[PDB]
Design a protein around this nucleic acid. Structure first.
Length: 87
DNA sequence: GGCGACCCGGCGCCCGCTACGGAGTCAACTACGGGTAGGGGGTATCGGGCAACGCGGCACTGAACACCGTTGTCATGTGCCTTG
């Protein structure tokens, strides 16, 4: 069958979730929160920028810039060696 | 007329795992009518890209006063000399 959850894939994905959450925790609290909302790491629906900019009380563009800074920081070679192997 | 064989149906199963071949197949038709679905066309709505512009530390603005420090200064007090 095709619906059977491959245990290898399941455990690899769980380890990916743990590593991703830890790497986000390495970042600042607000930065981790906004990037997680932008990519739905807590909920299956990511929120676009201005939709992040309602519960947090920041503008649709302030959120855009800090999201860009979070992407730049994550792209740093520091917090990339662990995530590269997971693809 | 219950016993009786016998007869028959009817059914029940028939060690263990790996490992080990493929193969796949014969007889209507058209007309309509709708409805969904596709396509492009155009339109309201959401999302992405830039400098001021919010702040804050401090810094300058020294300006304008304050804080001691100082040699300005004064009218007023001792010591020697001349005359009562």
């Amino acid at each position: 069958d095709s619906e059977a959850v491959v245990p290898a894939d399941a455990v690899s994905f769980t380890l990916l979730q743990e590593q991703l959450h830890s790497v986000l925790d390495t970042l600042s609290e607000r930065e981790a929160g906004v990037v997680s909302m932008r990519f739905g790491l807590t909920d299956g629906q990511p929120k676009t920028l201005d939709e992040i900019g309602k519960v947090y009380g920041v503008t649709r563009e302030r959120i855009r810039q800090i999201e860009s800074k979070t992407m730049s920081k994550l792209r740093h070679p520091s917090r990339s060696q662990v995530l590269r192997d997971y693809l």
